[PDB]
Amino acid sequence: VDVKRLAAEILGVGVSRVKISPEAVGRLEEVVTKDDVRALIDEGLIWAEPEKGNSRGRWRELHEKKKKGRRRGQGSRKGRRLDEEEAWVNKMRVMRRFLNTLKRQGKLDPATWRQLYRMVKGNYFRDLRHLKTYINEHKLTKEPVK
Amino acid sequence: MKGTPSMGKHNKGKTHIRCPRCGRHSYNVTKKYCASCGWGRSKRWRRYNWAK
Amino acid sequence: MIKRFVITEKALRLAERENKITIIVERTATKKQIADEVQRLYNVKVEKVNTLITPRGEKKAYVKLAEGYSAMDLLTKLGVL
Amino acid sequence: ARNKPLGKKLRLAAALNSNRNPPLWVIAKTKRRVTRSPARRHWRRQKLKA
Amino acid sequence: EKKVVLTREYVINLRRTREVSRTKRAKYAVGLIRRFVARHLKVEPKAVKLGQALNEALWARSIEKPPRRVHVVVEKLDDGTVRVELKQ
RNA sequence: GGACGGGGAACGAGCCCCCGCGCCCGUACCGAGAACCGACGCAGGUGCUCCUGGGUGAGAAGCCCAAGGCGGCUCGGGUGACCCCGGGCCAGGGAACUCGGCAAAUUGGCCCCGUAACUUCGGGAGAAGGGGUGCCUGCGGUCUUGGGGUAUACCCCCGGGAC
RNA sequence: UAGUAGCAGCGAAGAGGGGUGAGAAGCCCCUCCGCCGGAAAGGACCAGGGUUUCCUGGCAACUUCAAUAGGCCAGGAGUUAG
RNA sequence: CCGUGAGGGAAAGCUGAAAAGAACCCCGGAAGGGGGGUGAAAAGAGCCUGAAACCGGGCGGCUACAGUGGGGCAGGCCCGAA
RNA sequence: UAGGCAAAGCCGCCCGGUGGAUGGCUCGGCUCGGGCGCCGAAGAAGGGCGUGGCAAGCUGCGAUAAGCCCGGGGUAGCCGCA
């Protein structure tokens, strides 16, 4: 009978990881049942070596460096990384929620809100800082927007 | 492709099964009669004078 | 209807551990017929009947008896043990 | 096949039952004249047309 | 319980491994060590037993790149068999 | 399943508790570079039919490594001639080879600049052509995701993520 | 012919020690080395095959070499459903 | 047994009167070998007789300066019991 | 000069291994002559499956399964091929 098959089934690991001590080579031939394999496992002549997990210290170090901004230059890019459509969705949602909050709180007349909304949809503003700077410079609100 | 490569497609299909009346591997499952004894299409046994 | 008893290692373990008898019966016998036959012939109460058809073409039945009758005791009584 | 019909299963059971060489006592009884059986076969070599 | 009857230190040169096919260099090195020990201890190549550290040293860089030389200790036992160990 | 109608009894549930019955057939294993077909323990075909972790990466690509499995595409050793099959390099010349640039070689990703004749006005187009590309130390920006601040957007602080 | 061809090519492969055994490079165990890892390779499973499954024992024949190994041979067993 | 199927389809007889089927001893891992037995005869279960092709050994002739097979004549070596 | 004297190889005989001819044998075939001549819903022929203590095939039989009952013949052996 194959001892390693029963041992792997008992221990719930791979047969590749089941290890049989050479001191039980005599007792292997007398192994008949899974109870016998359990007895050998209890004695400690049969055990499961630990599985290998890929170490992540190198990855964590490289991830810290990438967060700081290394190893992402022109010579390290092979395909598209920035999503234009997702960027447009986020840009519209940021500007629209800001303008709608201003109109809801009453700082902007609905007509001025309409003009700003159409300019945002028409891509007049690069970013929220540009939108705020335009609002402050053209004085579309009674108090300045931070 | 008509030889050995096409021979590999004869591994899962079937034209005939065992006939209940004559016991040969000659019952056509799609035509629903036996190609040997004619069961399912003729109540009389199929046997021709040109066959020894 | 009963052809014989199965006295293999699996059948003996099932008899000692689960109160089950293993019999070889006619291939056309149903679970109802097997249960009634067991009850009539041996005067025990049948809890349930599991049936299968072996690869050699025979019907084998695992008859689990009620909780007042011993499968091992019945086997010893018939002397097929 | 995993899913079988009973008639095909019974024919396979008949082939399984018949597939066996003659017993040694039969060989001794016939004085080494009956050694083989026509129903002896190997599953990989000779195929039943079940 | 096996007693040592002789002990020597040897430096076995394995430069011949670079003259054979790259797909068998470590196994060829094992054969070279066995032949060297048999020649220098006057025994048959099957009476020589390689040690585990020596085997791992020979196989440390996989089948293609065995080390160029090994410093070993050879011991002749009272039954006539010989043991070879990597010196350490 | 519901609704809309007709008929009947004095009982009575789609709610709660409790009782009883559920027959027959399949069920092992392979599921394929050895369990199927191909005369074979066959580099083919059927079935890669459906599913699959980490790094790099545009990627279900390749390369390396998990989980898991394998060393059984079922000969081993020595030698290091020629010759053959497959692969690497080769000064100066650069198609003079040859039916013929066959074969091989060149180019190659991404970003920026730039892009002709012609055209069915859509295209041609990655036309062509040029430049950049590693690692390290810092400074920023655009968002995202939670929590805390008067605080639902903005603003400040804190933790994570992307570019 | 001839103890000759083939047992290469299709991107993996073996080594050390021990045990068993008449007999071991090859079977069993440990250690080292390697290959796959969206797969000629890990999980599931259809048709088809039909006992090849599991256990025990074995090597007259089979496996492109060997064998104490085996999908092989002999004996025994195994498939449970509202 | 072959073909999906209609269909197609082999090879393969003989111990001895009687198992009297080979006791027993030595060797071999085993198939088995030697010795020793049974039988009128091994006719030994691979079983009446047992041809030739083929292969092994013994014997006779030749055999490395001489081009092959068949016939006639002369000779050398060998057999020449019936 | 030739013999002692021989490589590989060639021819002939003998013995052995292989092979299964030959001869002998025959419960088989073939031809011819004579007879006899329908079975099935009272479920036939044919097929599948099963059936023996050890039983794989053939033969027989059919869950009463190499088989059960009755009568006649046949007497002492019998449990088919085996």
Ligand SMILES: [Mg+2]
């Ligand atoms: Mg890099």
Ligand SMILES: [Mg+2]
């Ligand atoms: Mg767009």
Ligand SMILES: [Mg+2]
């Ligand atoms: Mg065609």
Ligand SMILES: [Mg+2]
């Ligand atoms: Mg069809």
Ligand SMILES: [Mg+2]
């Ligand atoms: Mg069932």
Ligand SMILES: [Mg+2]
């Ligand atoms: Mg096949």
Ligand SMILES: [Mg+2]
């Ligand atoms: Mg299963």
Ligand SMILES: [Mg+2]
């Ligand atoms: Mg193969």
Ligand SMILES: [Mg+2]
């Ligand atoms: Mg990949």
Ligand SMILES: [Mg+2]
């Ligand atoms: Mg693993």
Ligand SMILES: [Mg+2]
């Ligand atoms: Mg190998």
Ligand SMILES: [Mg+2]
């Ligand atoms: Mg070789």
Ligand SMILES: [Mg+2]
């Ligand atoms: Mg050059």
Ligand SMILES: [Mg+2]
């Ligand atoms: Mg020219």
Ligand SMILES: [Mg+2]
């Ligand atoms: Mg020229």
Ligand SMILES: [Mg+2]
């Ligand atoms: Mg070209």
